[PDB]
Amino acid sequence: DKNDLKKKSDIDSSKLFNLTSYYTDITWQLDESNKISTDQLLNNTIILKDIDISVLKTSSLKVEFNSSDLANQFKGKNIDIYGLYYGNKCVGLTEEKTSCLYGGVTIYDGNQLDEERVIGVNVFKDGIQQEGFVIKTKKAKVTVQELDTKVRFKLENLYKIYNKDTGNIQKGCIFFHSNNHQNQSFYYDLYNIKGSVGAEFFQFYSDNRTVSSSNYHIDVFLYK
């Protein structure tokens, strides 16, 4: 239902400008393997050292989850991390330079595939099938954030989803469908972004929602 989707033209121009940066510059995508947390501030966070992010001049990473339960699942275990980080409003240890990411965490041990798993993305624009594409992961269990981000990056490149000076795409959504039909599909609205900075934009990923990479495919619906 197109009238349940938010409109690009209702997004403040400054916000579209900041979203464009997030989905144009690959440097915002953190992709770290076999790390381990060694500190914690709030009970729903874990802190990792020696994660060097050149563009923000930070050395530590705080991952924020929506529960103490999630943090407890991952604190002090070998983990992979994938997602979009932020530096502004990020609080770390007092004498450290820290960036922040919501969720994006998978157990490392036993989750590494012997080769890239390919996930199909079908794209429709005003109901007409467009050129499809794939995204890839090396993880058996993969965060939705990783899949969503890889798709959104490609959509920004091909369709200028978030560009402040384009207006030919006004609405859109991304659906995650189980191949075997055993899980209820779900979607995100591309133009339904919370707040005005990264600390707010990506907070919804704090659920650390995770799927089987073998069992999902993606459909994107775009509308003029």
Author numbering: 27 to 250
Q: What text does the study give?
A:
Superantigens (SAgs) are the critical virulence factors of Staphylococcus aureus. The multiple X-ray structures of staphylococcal SAgs revealed that the protein is composed of an N-terminal oligonucleotide-binding (OB) fold and a C-terminal β-grasp domain.
The structure of SEN was solved by molecular replacement, and the final model was refined at 1.8 Å resolution (Rwork = 0.171, Rfree = 0.201). There is one monomer per asymmetric unit. Overall, SEN is a compact molecule and shows the classic two-domain architecture of SAg proteins. Superposition of SEN and other SAg structures revealed that in the SEN structure, an asparagine (Asn44) is situated in a nearly identical position to that in the other SAgs. These amino acid variations might confer TRBV specificity to SEN. The ion-coordinating amino acids and their stabilizing amino acids are present in the structure of SEN.
